[PDB]
Design a protein around this motif. Structure first.
Motif: not given
Ligand SMILES: *[C@@H]1O[C@H](CO)[C@@H](O[C@@H]2O[C@H](CO)[C@@H](O)[C@H](O)[C@@H]2O)[C@H](O)[C@H]1NC(C)=O
Ligand SMILES: *[C@@H]1O[C@H](CO)[C@@H](O[C@@H]2O[C@H](CO)[C@@H](O)[C@H](O)[C@@H]2O)[C@H](O)[C@H]1NC(C)=O
Ligand SMILES: *[C@@H]1O[C@H](CO)[C@@H](O[C@@H]2O[C@H](CO)[C@@H](O)[C@H](O)[C@@H]2O)[C@H](O)[C@H]1NC(C)=O
Ligand SMILES: *[C@@H]1O[C@H](CO)[C@@H](O[C@@H]2O[C@H](CO)[C@@H](O)[C@H](O)[C@@H]2O)[C@H](O)[C@H]1NC(C)=O
Ligand SMILES: *[C@@H]1O[C@H](CO)[C@@H](O[C@@H]2O[C@H](CO)[C@@H](O)[C@H](O)[C@@H]2O)[C@H](O)[C@H]1NC(C)=O
Ligand SMILES: *[C@@H]1O[C@H](CO)[C@@H](O)[C@H](O)[C@H]1NC(C)=O
Ligand SMILES: *[C@@H]1O[C@H](CO)[C@@H](O)[C@H](O)[C@H]1NC(C)=O
Ligand SMILES: *[C@@H]1O[C@H](CO)[C@@H](O)[C@H](O)[C@H]1NC(C)=O
Ligand SMILES: *[C@@H]1O[C@H](CO)[C@@H](O)[C@H](O)[C@H]1NC(C)=O
Ligand SMILES: *[C@@H]1O[C@H](CO)[C@@H](O)[C@H](O)[C@H]1NC(C)=O
Ligand SMILES: *[C@@H]1O[C@H](CO)[C@@H](O)[C@H](O)[C@H]1NC(C)=O
Ligand SMILES: *[C@@H]1O[C@H](CO)[C@@H](O)[C@H](O)[C@H]1NC(C)=O
Ligand SMILES: *[C@@H]1O[C@H](CO)[C@@H](O)[C@H](O)[C@H]1NC(C)=O
Ligand SMILES: *[C@@H]1O[C@H](CO)[C@@H](O)[C@H](O)[C@H]1NC(C)=O
Ligand SMILES: *[C@@H]1O[C@H](CO)[C@@H](O)[C@H](O)[C@H]1NC(C)=O
Lengths: 182, 338, 343, 177, 48, 48
Positions: B272, B276-277, B279-280, D31, D35, D38-39, F30
């Motif tokens: 996760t 996400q990284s 995706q960014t 979630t 997500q 959102q994409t 993070y």
């Protein structure tokens, strides 16, 4: 076992790749090695006290150039970003993850700047691009009797102007052409 | 103006799960959340290809400059390709290439010397460690110079005709007179002050080279694009050093230290976070590609207007009443000489 | 629809061994085996499954007859040829419609070919079949689907495979299935008109990546290629630091049980081979760890309590025990994480 | 996609599990699905922005090549631009640019100016072109030779600065009448 | 009940929708069925 | 024609973990996820 892809478990760190001799200036207390981005690069031998670097395995990406299946079934393989003498010995020793093995006749070897092409041959002619390979190389389907060839871009037909001190070319005629923009 | 950037073709499967069968199986539950990323990145690469082709491939026939270079006193050796240089490049383009240092060239085949790096492995080897690769561009930085040379030859021996139909030759003096006529000054002025204007042109072409040489960074836009791409890539690689709220940051450590059904939570956390990284990173690449495509369209219009003819629109082709322009190739960009 | 599924299939253009019949070698079973057989009317009755094929492990027998089947998961003793000799630890007798369907158009030229596939994932034996008088030369080239017939939960271990014959007064097309990703083309009526493997050809990889039977001219990025590591090295520090185990088991005056000497073992590498070679043990029972699993776990501190005691007292010494030693001389806590060694 | 939960279908998971243990799995589903959404919405926004840029370009192309004539080169089709007709298309537009492209051309000769009597003559529009024996004037993108009269040219100079000037006689319809 | 939106619990499979006669070709071993994108579409009647 | 928008300078720690040391510490786990956000907001202000 140096200069060979191998799973290593040095003193608790585990990874994959190739290790060989290095010319670090490791301080006596130093044990690991890294880079700017925090990736384990060099490992000191715990039982020899020498310095060895750690390498990726074979990194690249396989791309397939093919004509329309309704035209032919012959295909050619692109091994992106790898000196393909490395895959040539890799194919020979059969440690390649790809299972599909396309033939190597010696003429189907291609040290392209963008990787290695296999299943296609040089043609030192110059034709307009059909399928973009990269690094100024284009593949196309052509008659010899039919195969897949690779060749350099031809930027266009070679033309030379006739500039002179007192030379003018003035069109004596004209034409009307209707193009399309979408 | 930038025309394109480096093309990255990351592979999520390994970038997130370094050669781990169980991690790949766990990622398989996330649906087609990889094919989308690969499709987006290959679309970006093809978009960059079309941007450079749209900017430069405006003329079909590759003209060559006549062997003798006397264009009525106009000195063009600084922008004309130099046969002595083995790359067949102009002296100005030489400085443009020298003043830009690419972190990742791509056309290196650097595998084989990461083991032989001797010193600490650089950004490229580090990226090659964790599922990152760069696709070299289709149009080699050499043939781009040939297209630039053809465009330059077309606009100094044939006027603006070759972009409309057949390339019709015209000497530079009366081509100059006509570019003057398109602004509001009769040709008699040029034919009376030809020596003065030729000296002005030579002085300006001499001064532009020194201005580009002595500046700290006047190519700051191309340097900025390269630095932005490199910084994004370096942050994306560095993101694998974050525990994301788990016990450790190393997949092979967690797998070999904990049992499957308890390490499942931690590996899910790692998935996760890392995904996400990625995706960014993909989204930022999309935004940068859109901006670069807009700039490339502007550059193509600029070429077809200023280089391939005289533009009446003020300030578009440099400040003042525009006369012509010469194109010059640059790393991941173009340089215009209004 | 062009659904793509990954499941254990038989590879396309794979290698199939062809047998004759005029003695029935025991072919190994792993990841299923594809079976085919062409015949005039009948020369084959059934198959037997399992490991060691004797009266010690559960086995299988799926012999057919003229009207029904004889599926059974039993522990047959032996036949070496009235096909079994033992039904003691045996259950689950299955009988249904006969597998073999034979049809002839008033001639023997319509030799029926029968393709059978078997698999044993999580038990649940799956039998797939399709009977049709194909061209009859050998394994055809035209595509044919397979319809599952029975799906029955055996839940046993299978390693070896064998086939049974008939009586009388060109078959055995055997191929081994492998875990591969496949895509199947479905007819609007639902039947499979075509299928393409995804581990055979570059064109197959492309068609699979875009799940379409028509690929247009162009380049397609399909996957990643890896040089897998050939060998695997494990290297650890040169440290040996042998524990004083030698001096705890080479002692000559092992204290009595009433005063049990307790040795604190610290700052050493606990190798258990020096323990294995020093004493021909008679009681090496462990409670918190495994006798085998000792060299791969790391501990904070180790105590070696040594005392010579009688024979029955060895069995006395254990967590949650009683006796004149377990109560007054040495009591092992019920929550003991360690081992005892008696020689 | 199961998204790391028991199943990917809510109407089964709600009845297979009670709330106080099912809320975790349904939250995992929420979630993952959000997500993905959102994409999708981000990609749709990017595509819409690109389409808006293309639509602005097409609107300018309409209002320029249709409601007028464009002097911009290589904007309303290759070559000199003459007209343009629009055509409707599914989710787009299609143009029919009509462009003027020249044809067969011949080297003749050129001179920057003509010096009749100590004065340099320059063409009011066009260049000075020579068959090889008789100097002439013509237009630029079509060869229409014309007699060099006082009307075609304007005189300004002294016949000693223009390099490559060529000697010939000019004419006028006023001395004759 | 056909042609009427109804909460169904066919064989423990829960959901909501409209049931109607279909001309599909379910195999005897087929039980649930589906559509292109993985949603239970045509469930044959276990009784009829 | 609009020419610019309001420039924003949102801050990671102050927005997410208002003056909470444990929350900031767990945010540090993070990585540099949000330094990207700060740089991007500086960029958008610069382009305005
Ligand atoms: C200019 O070019 C036109 C075509 O591009 C010529 O028209 C042609 O005329 C011939 C006969 O002369 C036809 O057979 C042909 O179909 C076409 O219509 C035109 O003549 C030409 N004009 C000059 C002055 O050369
Ligand atoms: C055009 O401009 C060139 C400038 O690059 C001139 O080259 C010069 O050559 C001299 C030696 O002859 C060098 O000292 C100088 O640095 C420069 O390289 C070139 O001569 C000039 N040609 C004409 C015809 O003006
Ligand atoms: C699917 O099944 C249908 C039912 O049999 C087939 O329709 C039939 O087609 C035959 C001709 O093949 C007609 O004679 C008959 O009246 C009926 O319409 C249909 O063809 C079939 N589709 C396939 C197999 O693709
Ligand atoms: C120069 O241009 C002249 C046009 O006025 C051409 O002269 C023509 O010659 C014919 C006979 O030769 C005359 O009858 C006609 O009236 C016209 O004047 C002449 O060909 C041309 N010269 C060259 C070399 O092209
Ligand atoms: C055009 O004709 C002029 C006379 O009408 C020429 O001028 C002559 O120039 C010579 C020197 O070249 C003088 O000696 C002479 O007295 C007269 O001034 C002129 O040269 C000529 N030019 C060309 C290009 O033919
Ligand atoms: C490692 O230990 C062995 C065993 O005695 C010895 O021969 C060797 O020299 C040691 N090497 C190092 C680097 O300590
Ligand atoms: C890659 O190219 C060739 C072929 O392998 C060889 O010289 C060597 O392996 C590599 N060379 C360089 C300069 O990287
Ligand atoms: C023909 O091709 C070969 C490579 O196959 C190349 O070395 C040679 O230079 C080519 N010849 C010409 C004239 O281009
Ligand atoms: C043009 O003229 C100059 C000098 O007047 C001469 O050096 C040059 O060679 C000439 N070129 C041509 C093409 O006639
Ligand atoms: C099947 O066996 C033959 C002979 O043993 C062998 O040559 C062939 O390669 C095998 N088939 C495949 C697909 O490898
Ligand atoms: C065939 O097998 C069935 C299995 O139940 C058995 O009942 C029957 O007696 C056998 N023989 C015949 C002729 O059907
Ligand atoms: C049943 O199984 C047990 C355990 O394997 C075995 O000891 C016993 O002999 C079997 N019964 C027989 C063979 O009758
Ligand atoms: C004591 O050590 C010696 C030397 O290795 C060995 O031969 C002997 O068997 C050992 N005896 C015991 C009781 O451990
Ligand atoms: C002009 O003359 C040159 C001299 O060779 C020739 O190559 C060119 O084709 C001519 N241009 C024409 C005929 O339009
Ligand atoms: C009860 O179920 C059996 C199973 O086939 C069958 O008789 C029928 O479907 C049902 N009987 C009814 C609905 O009367």
């Amino acid at each position: 076992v140096k200069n060979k892809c191998v799973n290593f478990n040095f003193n608790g760190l585990t990874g994959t790749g190739v290790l060989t001799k290095s010319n670090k200036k490791f301080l006596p207390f130093q044990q690991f090695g890294r880079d700017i981005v925090d990736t384990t690069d060099a490992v000191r031998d715990p039982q020899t006290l020498e310095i060895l670097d750690i390498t990726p395995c074979s990194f690249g990406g396989v791309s397939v150039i093919t004509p329309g299946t309704n035209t032919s079934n012959q295909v050619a393989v692109l091994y992106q970003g790898v000196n393909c003498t490395e895959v040539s010995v890799a194919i020979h020793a059969d440690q390649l993850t790809p299972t599909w093995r396309v033939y190597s006749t010696g003429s189907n070897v291609f040290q392209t700047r963008a990787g290695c092409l296999i299943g296609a041959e040089y043609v030192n002619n110059s034709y307009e691009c059909d399928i973009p390979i990269g690094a100024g190389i284009c593949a196309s389907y052509q008659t010899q009797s039919q195969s897949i060839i690779a060749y350099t871009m031809s930027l266009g037909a070679e033309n030379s102007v006739a500039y002179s001190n007192n030379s003018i070319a003035i069109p004596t005629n004209f034409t009307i052409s209707v193009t399309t923009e979408i | 103006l930038p025309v394109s950037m480096t093309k990255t073709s990351v592979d999520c499967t390994m970038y997130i799960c370094g050669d781990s069968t169980e991690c790949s199986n766990l990622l398989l539950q996330y649906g087609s959340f990889c094919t989308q990323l690969k499709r987006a990145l290959t679309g970006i690469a093809v978009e960059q290809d079309k941007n450079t082709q749209e900017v430069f491939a405006q003329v079909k026939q590759i003209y060559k400059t006549p062997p003798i270079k006397y264009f009525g006193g106009f000195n063009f050796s600084q922008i004309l390709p130099d046969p002595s240089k083995p790359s067949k490049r102009s002296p100005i383009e030489d400085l443009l290439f020298n003043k830009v240092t690419l972190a990742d060239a791509g056309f290196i085949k650097q595998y084989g010397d990461c083991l032989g790096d001797i010193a600490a492995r650089d950004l490229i080897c580090a990226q090659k460690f964790n599922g990152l690769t760069v696709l070299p561009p289709l149009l080699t930085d050499e043939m781009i110079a040939q297209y630039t040379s053809a465009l330059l030859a077309g606009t100094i021996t044939s006027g603006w005709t070759f972009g409309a139909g057949p390339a019709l030759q015209i000497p530079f003096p009366m081509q100059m007179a006509y570019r003057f006529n398109g602004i509001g000054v009769t040709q008699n002025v040029l034919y009376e002050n030809q020596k003065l204007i030729a000296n002005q042109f030579n002085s300006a072409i001499g001064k532009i080279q020194d201005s580009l040489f002595s500046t700290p960074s006047a190519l700051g836009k191309l340097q900025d694009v390269v630095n932005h791409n490199a910084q994004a890539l370096n942050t994306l690689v560095k993101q694998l050093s974050s525990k994301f709220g788990a016990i450790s940051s190393v997949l092979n450590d967690i797998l070999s230290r904990l049992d499957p059904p308890e390490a499942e939570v931690q590996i899910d956390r790692l998935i996760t976070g890392r995904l996400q990284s990625l995706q960014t990173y993909v989204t930022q690449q999309l935004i940068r590609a859109a901006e670069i495509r807009a700039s490339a369209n502007l550059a193509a219009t600029k070429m077809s207007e200023c280089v391939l003819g005289q533009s009446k629109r003020v300030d578009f082709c440099g400040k003042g009443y525009h006369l012509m322009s010469f194109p010059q190739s640059a790393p991941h960009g173009v340089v215009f000489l209004h | 629809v062009l659904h793509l599924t990954q499941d254990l299939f038989l590879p396309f253009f794979s290698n199939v061994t062809w047998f004759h019949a005029i003695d029935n070698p025991v072919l190994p079973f792993n990841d299923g085996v594809y079976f085919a057989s062409t015949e005039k009317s009948n020369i084959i009755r059934g198959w037997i499954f399992g490991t060691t094929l004797d009266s010690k492990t559960q086995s299988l027998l799926i012999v057919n007859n003229a009207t029904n089947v004889f599926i059974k998961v039993c522990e047959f003793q032996f036949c070496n040829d009235g096909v079994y000799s033992s039904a003691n630890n045996c259950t689950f007798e299955y009988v249904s419609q006969p597998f073999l369907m034979d049809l002839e158009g008033k001639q023997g030229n319509f030799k029926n070919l029968r393709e059978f596939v078997f698999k044993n994932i999580d038990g649940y034996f799956k039998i797939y079949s399709k009977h049709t008088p194909i061209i009859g030369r050998d394994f055809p080239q035209g595509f044919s689907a397979l319809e599952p017939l029975v799906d029955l939960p055996i839940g046993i271990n299978i390693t070896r495979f064998q086939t049974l014959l008939a009586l009388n007064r060109a078959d055995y097309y055997v191929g081994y299935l492998q875990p591969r990703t496949f895509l199947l083309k479905y007819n609007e009526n639902g039947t499979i008109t075509d299928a393409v493997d995804c581990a055979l050809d570059p064109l197959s990889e492309t068609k699979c990546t875009l799940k379409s039977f028509t690929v247009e001219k162009g380049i397609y990025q399909t996957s990643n290629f890896r040089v897998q590591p050939t060998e695997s090295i494990v290297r650890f520090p040169n440290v040996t630091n042998l524990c004083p185990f030698h001096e705890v088991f080479n002692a000559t005056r092992f204290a009595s049980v009433y005063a049990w000497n307790r040795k604190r073992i610290s700052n050493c590498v606990a190798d258990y081979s020096v323990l294995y070679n020093f004493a021909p043990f008679f009681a090496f029972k462990c409670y918190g760890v495994s006798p085998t699993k000792l060299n791969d776990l790391c501990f904070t501190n180790v105590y070696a309590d040594s005392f010579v005691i009688k024979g029955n007292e060895v069995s006395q010494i254990a967590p949650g025990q009683t006796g004149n030693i377990a109560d007054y001389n040495y009591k092992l806590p019920d929550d003991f994480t360690g081992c005892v060694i008696a020689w | 996609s199961k998204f790391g939960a028991i199943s990917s279908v809510l109407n089964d998971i709600l009845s297979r599990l009670d709330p106080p243990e099912a809320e975790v799995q349904i939250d995992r589903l929420i979630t993952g699905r959000l997500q993905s959404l959102q994409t999708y919405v981000t990609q749709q926004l990017i595509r819409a922005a690109e389409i808006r840029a293309s639509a602005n370009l097409a609107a300018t192309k309409m209002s320029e090549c249709v409601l007028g004539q464009s002097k911009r080169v290589d904007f309303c089709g290759k070559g000199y631009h003459l007209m343009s007709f629009p055509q409707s298309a599914p989710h787009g537009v299609v143009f029919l640019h009509v462009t003027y492209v020249p044809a067969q051309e011949k080297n003749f000769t050129t001179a920057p100016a003509i010096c009749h009597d100590g004065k340099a003559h320059f063409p009011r529009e066009g260049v000075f072109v020579s068959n090889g024996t008789h100097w002439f004037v013509t237009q630029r993108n079509f060869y229409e030779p014309q007699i060099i009269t006082t009307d075609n040219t304007f005189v300004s100079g002294n016949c000693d600065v223009v390099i490559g000037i060529v000697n010939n006689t000019v004419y006028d319809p006023l001395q004759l009448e």
